[PDB]
Write a protein that binds this ligand. Structure first.
Ligand code: CL
Ligand code: CL
Ligand code: CL
Ligand code: ZN
Ligand code: ZN
Ligand code: ZN
Lengths: 114, 114, 114
């Protein structure tokens, strides 16, 4: 699984340990081994949410399976909770795009996951 | 809706007011309230288009609905127009990926839009 | 085609000529004319792969057609080879999301490709 967060929160406001915490919690939530989880945080962005530039986040989760109505609600609770607690971003100023990928459509290690 | 523009135009060449203009113009175009529009501009990027490093932009629009043949043509004219007028990017050096998202695949406020 | 690479490798470790090499080799691999190939490289990123901050890359390839199981394997071999040779990233620390786009969902030059 691949989780990306783009935010206007400054770099110095991203606490030490954040990438590891995302990795750990997404392994737990998706049920995939942590070795297969990738995370990426992009602070200091020029962005607005609903016309204002208070803290906000635009995110994505790509996964080979483990995407669906109830799963995605659970991911969103987890991820908005982390963004609120660690980055002080209100949950109502977070969007997360969920993308269910076919194995043949994910490249890795000179091939695909097919 | 979520609109992202990645460009090699320098930060100083992005006008004050550009995020607000994008927000207003996208609210009008999608028919959705401004409160639901998120915009993100990423200048100073290392990019090329057709092998050239003249000004260019790589963009995306995600929306729950309001995506389709005619609508996307209209969005492309609007958005290329804004990129030309405000960032001085030629329309033939812009790509916009349109993604129609299901409500269950968009996280927001500790849940999804389903 | 649009190819994006996000990496924790520093900017100074991205060799001169890399965007041009990507452009040329993607044109060949995809069959598409070079004028339609867009490339974007984003160094210095705060990312982890498998919980580790060793060099890694998170990438995407969008194309109107030319996406499929054998093609994607071929792209992955090409692109992981380039990331290994030029950026010193292990192929087993690269993910590439492949997205086959409908022509009507790609904006360019004030319109779409439909
Ligand atoms: Cl996304
Ligand atoms: Cl996109
Ligand atoms: Cl992607
Ligand atoms: Zn997306
Ligand atoms: Zn896309
Ligand atoms: Zn994607």
């Amino acid at each position: 699984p691949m989780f990306i967060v783009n935010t206007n929160v400054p770099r110095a406001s991203v606490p030490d340990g954040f990438l590891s915490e995302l990795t750990q919690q997404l392994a737990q939530a998706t049920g995939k081994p942590p070795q297969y989880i990738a995370v990426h945080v992009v602070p200091d962005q020029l962005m607005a949410f609903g016309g204002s530039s208070e803290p906000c986040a635009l995110c994505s989760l790509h996964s080979i399976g483990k995407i669906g109505g109830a799963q995605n609600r659970s991911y969103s609770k987890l991820l908005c909770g982390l963004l609120a607690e660690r980055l002080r971003i209100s949950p109502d100023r977070v969007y997360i795009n969920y993308h269910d990928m076919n194995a043949a459509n994910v490249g890795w290690n000179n091939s695909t996951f097919a």
